[PDB]
Every structure is written in structure tokens, then in C-alpha cells.
Structure 1
Amino acid sequence: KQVSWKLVTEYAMETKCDDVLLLLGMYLEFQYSFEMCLKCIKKEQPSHYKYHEKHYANAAIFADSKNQKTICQQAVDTVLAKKRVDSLQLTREQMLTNRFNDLLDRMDIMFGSTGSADIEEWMAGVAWLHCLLPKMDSVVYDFLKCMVYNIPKKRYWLFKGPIDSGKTTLAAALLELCGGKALNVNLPLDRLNFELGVAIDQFLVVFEDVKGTGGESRDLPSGQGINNLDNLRDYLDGSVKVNLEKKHLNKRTQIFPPGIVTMNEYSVPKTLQARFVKQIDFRPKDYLKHCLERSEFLLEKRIIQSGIALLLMLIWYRPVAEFAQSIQSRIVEWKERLDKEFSLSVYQKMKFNVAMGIGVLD
């Protein structure tokens, strides 16, 4: 007759839910009969159907509790605590491995009998992405290594190029591939600290569309983004720990996460450039655009900016020995799944269509 706080926490931990309202909403859905539950029968959400039955009894009681929010708060704090421990005790490679396993879990479902994704359309995204930059699978691989090694002053990559050249598309994919947050430093430096606070315990960070000053010649608006980053050298450096605040108060002193900076060809101060271990210049390509025009599903289903598309790319191009030993078995399994559905020629055909700019699946 008493709610089990521990069970709510268990559910939060199992789904890695660190959103109090989301947790509250999800758990309240379990208060209803699992025997007569359509959400479970239709297998709509794993975070729901894989847990409804076990949590039914506790949820029924939870529904009558007067401290619902408080209970969920402790549950979420436990998830945050776990993330804090992992950030301090796991190797960065282990962190990425956990991320990859979560993505593979989503893949098993989305490409399984209860999924609505078409593996063929996703491989088409892999094809398009592999035409965006030279040796794309190596670019992605080298990025992962850079993020994992997290070497002082060799932690950031710069994505520079004209409008609609693919900077955000790839940055977004990489961000989802590794896990992390996108930060906006173009806003006033007043609320800057709080924006930077979002990076606490994150694997990596992406400073999106940072604006500079000298660029009115190229019809580029001026902003303080670049000046702001140049005032954050100890953040990009990753040598000394910085002081992040995320709760209207100082919450954590830590090495700032490594990451990416994307921008529109503004001038970059040498002091800031020294923080970028690699710079990639993106170039708009007619065929990529024309291909997208006839391959609308790549944007509508958000495939080319997905970390899942990048993960598939790695599974298709990279040798098993490069992946963490603990996950290799699972990788081999997906390599076999892919070979059984896409011959080399078929994939080559997709890339061909991209270069020709004529519908990837044509």
C-alpha cells in the first residue's frame, strides 16, 4: 500500500530518463491494466511496453501518491549521479561503446519486425554522406579517435564553409553518434555561463554557427561568437578544469568536453586557430543538391543528419578489429545483416546516382 521509490528509480535508470516530467508521464501510463493495454500490444514504445507489466502494481499505488514529483526527482537525481560517476570512472572508449550499444538497440528495433524504418533508405543516406567529403568513413573514424583520446589542445575540429555546404548535417550526425550537446555562443555573454553549463558531464560539444566580425565583404553578418570562443581558451584547451554552473549555481569543476565548431568562413584569430587540431572546408555540390531533390526521404526522415547513418557507415566500411572488443560480436552481426541486404554493386549504384545527382534509389 506504500509506493516503492526504488522501483521508480529502477525504471528511470533502465531508460536513462533524466527528465522529471517525462519520467512522471511515463510512469503514470503504467497505472492502467497491462492486460488490456494497446500501447503494449501495438509495441509502440520500448520505454513503455518493455516495462509496463513489471511496474503495473507499483504504478497503481504511485497514482494515489501525494509526492509524485518528489519521487521522480530522486529517481532523476540517481540517473544524473550515475552519469557523473561514469564521466569520472569510465574510459572514454567505454563511454563511446555504451553509446554505440544504445544506438544499436534502436537499430535492432527500427530495422526489425516492429520497426518502421527502411534499411534501404538508410543505406542511401550512407551513400549520400560518403559523397559529401573525401574518404568520409576515415573522417568519421579519425573524429571518434580524436574525441576518445581527448588530447590537451588537440580536441577541436573546425567545420568551415558557405551556406548549405553540409557543416550542420555532419555535425548533427556526429553529435548524435557520440552523444553530447550543441551550444549557442552567439547570444549575450550574460547568459553565456548557463549555456556553457549544459556541457556538464557531456561526451562532446558542438558550437554551432559561430559568427565573427570581419566578413561584411562576403555578405556575412557580424557577431561575437568568435570573440567569445577566443575568451574560452581554457575551455577548448582541456588542460585545466573549468568551472561550469548548471542550476543557477556552480555545479561542476571539470575538463570541458572536446568537440566541433562550425562557421561561415569568417576570419579566425591565430590564438583560436591553435585550438583547432583539424579544419575541414565544406563545399556546396550541385549533384548532392540535385540528388536530394529526387531523394526527399533523406531529409524528411532526417537520415543524412543521423548518427545512425554514420554508425551504419562505420559497420559497412570499417574492419571489426577497430571497434571495441566487447562490441565486436554485435558489429559482426550487423555486417552480416548488411551484406545479406546490399551487394557491393547495389551500394556502388547508389553512390553513382548521387554523383549523377539523380535519385539515390533510381
Structure 2
Amino acid sequence: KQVSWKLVTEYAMETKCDDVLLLLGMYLEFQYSFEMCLKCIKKEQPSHYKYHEKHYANAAIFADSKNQKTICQQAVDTVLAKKRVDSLQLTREQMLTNRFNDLLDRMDIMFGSTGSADIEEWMAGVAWLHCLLPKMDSVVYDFLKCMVYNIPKKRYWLFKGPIDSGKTTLAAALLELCGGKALNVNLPLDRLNFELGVAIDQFLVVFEDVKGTGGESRDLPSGQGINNLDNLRDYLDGSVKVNLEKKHLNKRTQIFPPGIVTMNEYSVPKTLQARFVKQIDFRPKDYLKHCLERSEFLLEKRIIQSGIALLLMLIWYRPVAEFAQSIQSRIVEWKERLDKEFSLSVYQKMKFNVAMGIGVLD
């Protein structure tokens, strides 16, 4: 009998696997019998125990075949092909709704009876993260609105601020919440081709700590960063399609994703400042440092970096009327699940702990 390539493509789509070697490794683990399988008995990874019995028969034949990597390439290209169809067809609010919906599935396994997370720790993160900027919850709502409306020229946000000031923590959470990629532009411009190529079919890009000019008086080293961005004006404004190249593939023409530039106290050119909508001035808070020092779990579990933490903040602070209609049915359940867990009293006490630089949970 012969390997069904469709079952492998179905598994790859079901688990959304776009790495050929991960797909090979995952599928090969199905060749052992399910009735004696320790991974299915422990229920470690859902990407195994859901699929093993279904794919066992195909995986035994797959394990004997001579072109295993060809089978996996096609399945991976099917997943990359669906992403390109979705990227070119879907309305941009449906992109964010699909990303929210994926986070909400991922949340339900995190905090479930088979879970391994404490909502009180993650809500202590929400409280800490809301302290970082004045009216952070409203600021995240009009950031999300900005990225959905994607108005040409008026597409990008600038996060300036000192060393250890929280711009990479917020940008990392917004990156996870909106579902983007982080890009490095401090390299020479002709290495930048394939790196800009990673923005292909993504929703946000974050340009992480772009280095400027004139920083030497402040011990801030100079680099190619600002000069690359100020050449890439064709990409930031989105007025036209620019062409993104990636291996084994034709160069996609697309309007480059919107997003976030994160920057230290470099001077920014007048030509470049014209293309950022809003500048958030991050600055270090004395109390927040002591709060984390007395609350190690925030950093160890990466709570303050997480889009799940910012999503929990949007459950708490914004009306249900703001969410997409197909997901409102999930949002109102998670509303009552936070209402049934945190009183406004405990939240205000733990937020006050942050403001005092006391341990948030005290």
C-alpha cells in the first residue's frame, strides 16, 4: 500500500505547520502504535495526542517511504499557500479576528483543568502593564484601530525612550496580539532583501531598536538603522506595492505591513518623522522596577511580554461592543470568567501594590 500525501497535507493544515522538518518529525512520531503510546497517555502536546490514532496507518507507510521530505514540502507549501490566499483576500478586521480567535483557543487550554497557568498571575501582569503608560487600555484600542484601518502614510507608530524603558515589552505584546514579525534593519542594505522578505503575508512588523546618528555624546552607538529606514520610505508609507523576495518562491508584490519603530534617544530626521502617526515617549518608572524585582514570575513566565496579557486587558477595560461579532460570543464568556475570579477590590489592591513598588500579589 502507498502513502497518502493528502493525509499529511491534512495534518499539516490542521496543526498549521509551515516548517518542513517539524512536520517530518511530528509525523514520524506517529509510526509507533497508539495503544501503547506514552505521549498519548500523558497528553503532553495536543499536536500529537489528537492526531496519532488518525494518522498512525499513514505514518507507518510514510516511515518506509523513500521521498519523505518531498511529501512534507508539498504539505508545507499547501499551508504557505493558504496563508497567501488569506493575506490577499481577507478583510483586515477578519485577520485580527482570526488572530484573536487563535489566542482564545490557546487561552482555553492554558487556563483549563489540564492547564498550567494562574489567572491571578496573568492579571497581575495586566495590572502592571496598565501602569506603564497613561490610559494604556485606550492607547492599545486606538493602536489596534490604527493597524486595522491602515490609512496610507498614517500607518506607523514611534516608540522612543531610554534604555530599559519598556518599549520592547509593549512592542513584543502588540506583536503577539496583532500577529506580526520582528525585523532587524541595522545590517547593510543588501542583506536586508530577504529580511524584509519575512514581512510577506504578515499583519505587523516591529523594527527593533533601530540605531541612529549623533548618539555618541550619550554613549549611544551609531549605525545603518536610520539610514536604511529613511531609504525605505517607499515601504513605510504604503503608497505603492513593493516587492518582497523569499526562497523557493516568486517575489510577492505587496503593500508592506504597518507597525512599530522602537528607538532610543537618537535624533530623528525631518523626512522620517513626517511618516510616523504618534510617538509614545516611554520613560522608566522607579516603582515598576521594584515591582518586578518583588514579582519574579512576571518575567519568568514572560507575562508582561505577552499578547495574551494585553488581550486579557482588553477583556477587562473595553466594552463588548468593540469586538468582532463572531467573537463576541467568546468574549462575554471570558468576561464572566474574569468577573467570577477577580473582585474590583483585589485588582485595585494589586494595582496599588505596583504603584507602591511593592510585590504585586501582596
TM-score, normalised to structure 2, is 0.98
For 1:228 and 1:297, the matched residues in 2 are separated by: 38
Shift of 1:267: 0.7
Matched position secondary structure for 1:213: coil
Deviations along 1:17-41, whole A, 9 cap, x unmatched? 1011111111111111112222122
Give the 3 Å change call, closer, same or farther, for CA 66–249 of structure 1 in structure 2. closer
Q: Kindly indicate whether the alpha-carbon contact (under 8 Å) linking 1:7 and 1:55 is maintained by their aligned counterparts in 2.
A: yes
Deviations along 1:102-139, whole A, 9 cap, x unmatched? 11111100100111111110000001000011111111
Shift of 1:249: 6.9
Matched position secondary structure for 2:187: coil
Shift of 1:248: 7.4
For 2:336 and 2:171, the matched residues in 1 are separated by: 28
Q: Kindly indicate whether the alpha-carbon contact (under 8 Å) linking 1:243 and 1:250 is maintained by their aligned counterparts in 2.
A: no
Shift of 1:154: 0.8
Aligned length: 362
Shift of 1:46: 1.4
Matched position secondary structure for 1:295: coil
For 1:348 and 1:50, the matched residues in 2 are separated by: 41
Q: Kindly indicate whether the alpha-carbon contact (under 8 Å) linking 1:158 and 1:262 is maintained by their aligned counterparts in 2.
A: yes
For 1:340 and 1:34, the matched residues in 2 are separated by: 39
Give the 3 Å change call, closer, same or farther, for CA 191–250 of structure 1 in structure 2. farther
For 1:226 and 1:149, the matched residues in 2 are separated by: 26
For 1:353 and 1:199, the matched residues in 2 are separated by: 40
For 1:21 and 1:248, the matched residues in 2 are separated by: 16
For 1:160 and 1:67, the matched residues in 2 are separated by: 51
Matched position secondary structure for 2:315: helix
Shift of 1:221: 0.6
Shift of 1:250: 5.1
For 1:356 and 1:177, the matched residues in 2 are separated by: 29
Q: Kindly indicate whether the alpha-carbon contact (under 8 Å) linking 1:194 and 1:248 is maintained by their aligned counterparts in 2.
A: no
For 2:53 and 2:339, the matched residues in 1 are separated by: 37
Matched position secondary structure for 1:278: strand
Shift of 1:190: 2.1
Structure 1 residue aligned with 2:343: 343
For 1:207 and 1:250, the matched residues in 2 are separated by: 25
Deviations along 1:170-190, whole A, 9 cap, x unmatched? 000110111111000001212
Shift of 1:222: 0.6
Matched position secondary structure for 2:34: coil
State the Cα RMSD in Å. Answer: 1.0
Q: Kindly indicate whether the alpha-carbon contact (under 8 Å) linking 1:241 and 1:253 is maintained by their aligned counterparts in 2.
A: yes
Specify every segment of 5 or more residues in structure 2 that has no aligned partner in the other structure, as ranges. Answer: none
Matched position secondary structure for 1:250: coil
For 2:290 and 2:248, the matched residues in 1 are separated by: 47
For 1:224 and 1:58, the matched residues in 2 are separated by: 51
Specify every segment of 5 or more residues in structure 1 that has no aligned partner in the other structure, as ranges. Answer: none
For 2:100 and 2:38, the matched residues in 1 are separated by: 30
Structure 2 residue aligned with 1:184: 184
Deviations along 1:269-314, whole A, 9 cap, x unmatched? 1111111011100010111000000000000110000011001110
Q: Greater CA deviation, 326-335 or 36-45?
A: 36-45
Q: Kindly indicate whether the alpha-carbon contact (under 8 Å) linking 1:320 and 1:331 is maintained by their aligned counterparts in 2.
A: yes
Matched position secondary structure for 1:358: coil
Structure 1 residue aligned with 2:157: 157
For 1:160 and 1:226, the matched residues in 2 are separated by: 13
TM-score, normalised to structure 1, is 0.98
Q: Kindly indicate whether the alpha-carbon contact (under 8 Å) linking 1:43 and 1:114 is maintained by their aligned counterparts in 2.
A: no
Shift of 1:61: 1.2
Deviations along 1:215-243, whole A, 9 cap, x unmatched? 21222111110111000001001110001
Residue identity (%): 100
Matched position secondary structure for 1:260: strand
For 1:127 and 1:139, the matched residues in 2 are separated by: 15
